[PDB]
Structure 1
Amino acid sequence: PIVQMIHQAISPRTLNAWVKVVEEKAFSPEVIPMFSALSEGATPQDLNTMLNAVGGHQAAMQMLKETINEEAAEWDRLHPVHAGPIAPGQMREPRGSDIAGTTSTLQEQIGWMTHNPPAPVGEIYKRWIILGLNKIVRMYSPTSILDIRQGPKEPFRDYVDRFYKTLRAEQASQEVKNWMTETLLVQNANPDCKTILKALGPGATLEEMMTACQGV
């Protein structure tokens, strides 16, 4: 990575940690925060190191390439390159492939990120990676939010854990997710809790809802 702003290599355990996360948790939503955490201040080189260190899941890793390539092609389109000699003390304008690390050196990656003002190719690439990871998570989710329904003997707290887990891996803006909580959570609770929660009122908190069906 680069940290306050001097360069270092990705640490054995930063890397090892990332691999064990992909081994154990596969593509659960918490993989992405974990990724962003382990990749804080990372160069494209460091970012590629993390992705390529994953053996197995090559279907998903290949989808991640396709996504990265789309974002790179879009970048090139939005940022058309200008020809000419690059002056002294200046950098070339980074292409999509320079950002993804495939056609830039570590030195150029350091040159862009440390520049005044910075050309933050680490953060621009990390965006595209996470963008593509969100697709993989959403795709590899087993369940649909419509099918989470409280069982007759199920403690309310467990149903809420199922619901909000399944909700975490859905393709929905916050407004669409707001509506699912607004509509489905109370609707698809079992007849006992369902009637209890309907009596609380339309603007009731989760804490209030969850404590309402505590003895239930």
Structure 2
Amino acid sequence: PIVQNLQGQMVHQAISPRTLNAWVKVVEEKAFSPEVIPMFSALSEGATPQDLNTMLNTVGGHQAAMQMLKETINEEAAEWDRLHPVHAGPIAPGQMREPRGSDIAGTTSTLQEQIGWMTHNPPIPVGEIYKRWIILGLNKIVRMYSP
């Protein structure tokens, strides 16, 4: 995640193993139950896309759901690209590039790039955009997996 250091700057720090394991354990115990979404939200505080793929990729089991989510993440990403067209002409030397759906999904962007966008002024909340897609896709799952 990207956290604030004592000095008063935003720097990246790694997520903790008993945080990781707590994510694992939630999924083990409460599967598709709604409490998973606030839980997720708390444990995703200050998290990167990269950390969010890590959390999704580290799941075991419920592979039908994991595939449905993936496909929702790509749909929501396809929709990001649709709604926000690429911008006019070449990229400025003085500036950094606008993200695509795949940069938001973490796929085409690097960590330093993910830190550029979030730490820069104005900052862009690429975590929160992926977060809604995850929560939206979580609703899809919850609604389906209701019996």
TM over 0.5: same fold? yes
Match in the other structure for 1:84: 89
Q: Are 1:105 and 2:110 matched, yes or no?
A: yes
How far is the alpha carbon of 1:15 from its aligned partner? 1.2
Q: What stretches of structure 2 of length at least 5 have no aligned partner? A: 4-8
Q: What stretches of structure 1 of length at least 5 have no aligned partner? A: 143-216
How far is the alpha carbon of 1:66 from its aligned partner? 1.0
- Whole-angstrom CA distance in 2 between matches of 1:7 and 1:111: 11
Deviations 1:105-159 (A, max 9, x none): 11111111111101111111111111101111111112xxxxxxxxxxxxxxxxx
How far is the alpha carbon of 1:85 from its aligned partner? 3.6
- Whole-angstrom CA distance in 2 between matches of 1:78 and 1:25: 35
Deviations 1:67-106 (A, max 9, x none): 1111111110111112644323422110000100111111
Deviations 1:19-43 (A, max 9, x none): 1111111010000111011111110
- Whole-angstrom CA distance in 2 between matches of 1:132 and 1:85: 35
- Whole-angstrom CA distance in 2 between matches of 1:31 and 1:25: 7
Alignment counterpart, residue 98 of structure 2, candidates 93, 109, 112: 93
- Whole-angstrom CA distance in 2 between matches of 1:9 and 1:130: 23
Q: Secondary structure at the match of 1:6?
A: strand
Q: CA RMSD in A?
A: 1.3
Higher relative contact order (CA 8 A, sep 6+): 2
Q: Secondary structure at the match of 1:33?
A: helix
Q: Could you say if the C-alpha distance between residues 118 and 26 of structure 1 is closer, same or farther in structure 2, counting changes exceeding 3 Å?
A: same
Q: Map of 1:49-88 to 2, 5 A cutoff?
A: 49-82=54-87, 84-88=89-93
| Residue-pair matches, total | 142
- Whole-angstrom CA distance in 1 between matches of 2:92 and 2:23: 40
- Whole-angstrom CA distance in 2 between matches of 1:84 and 1:102: 24
Structure 1 residue ranges (4+ consecutive) displaced by more than 6 angstroms after TM superposition: none
**Percent identity among equivalent residues?**
98
More divergent stretch after superposition (51-60 vs 77-86): 77-86
How high is the TM-score relative to the length of structure 2? 0.91
Q: Secondary structure at the match of 1:89?
A: coil
